[PDB]
Amino acid sequence: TLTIDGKNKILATLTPTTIILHNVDPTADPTANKVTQPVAIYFSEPDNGLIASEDTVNITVVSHYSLWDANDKCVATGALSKPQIYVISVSVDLN
Amino acid sequence: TLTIDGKNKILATLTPTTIILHNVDPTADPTANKVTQPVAIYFSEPDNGLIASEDTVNITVPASATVSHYSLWDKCVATGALSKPQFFEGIYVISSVSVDLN
Amino acid sequence: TAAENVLQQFKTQIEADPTIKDKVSVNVTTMIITKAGDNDFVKVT
Secondary structure: OEOHHHHHHHHOOOOOOEEEEEOOOOOOOOOOOEOOOOEEOOEOOOEOOEEEEOOOOEEOOOOEEEEEOOOOOEEEEEEOOOOOOEEOOOEEEOO | OEOHHHHHHHHOOOOOOEEEEEOOOOOOOOOOOEOOOOEEOOEOOOOOOEEEEOOOEEEEEOOOOEEEEEEEEOOEEEEEEEEEEEEOOEEEEEOOOEEEOO | OOOHHHHHHHHHHHHOOOOHHHHOEEEEOOEEEEOOOOOOOOOOO
16 A cells, blocks of 8 residues: 555556557567557656656557557557557656 | 455555564554564565565564564555464464455 | 747747756847756757
């Protein structure tokens, strides 16, 4: 049950830098199923346990996604709004 | 929906050096209601998005005091309620304390 | 797509840019562009 201060401490170090979309869920395996190419994404400072993207990235061509950090390690995964150019109209939360 | 790698990287940066016991709930105000003095605690390396203290901790509860909660410091980073309150003087034994993201 | 005002528009867009504002400097009076912070390479075309 971390306090807000601890959560602010935490999220400051978890800094993703690129996002890749997949036709199949990459949570089981973040390597295969890559449909797009690395697209840069930027995030603001943490606050209340939330970090939000600074700009709505535009990706060229899936129903899934997978965040990556600067050292080729996947840090998040999940499914998109709808299967199917895709516009990323996104934040990371500890709640 | 962080992966295990993200949880491990995140938890490696928590460095709670000491613990303090409180009779009133410290979540609303962790600075007041100090029952016992700070006691050093040690934490292991993260694994599967979880950490735990490497060894037991002994704390001297002052006279005619009661313990209800605890708070970690290094600044404060976490708080929680003890499994059961206890009106003692004596030594209160804290086994492994775990912090989890699951 | 509509002289100082065009350069000021460019300067504001650059300084509000998510990435370029971090690592490029702009000054206007004519316009000038140089390094900012650590960045070692910059080009304009």
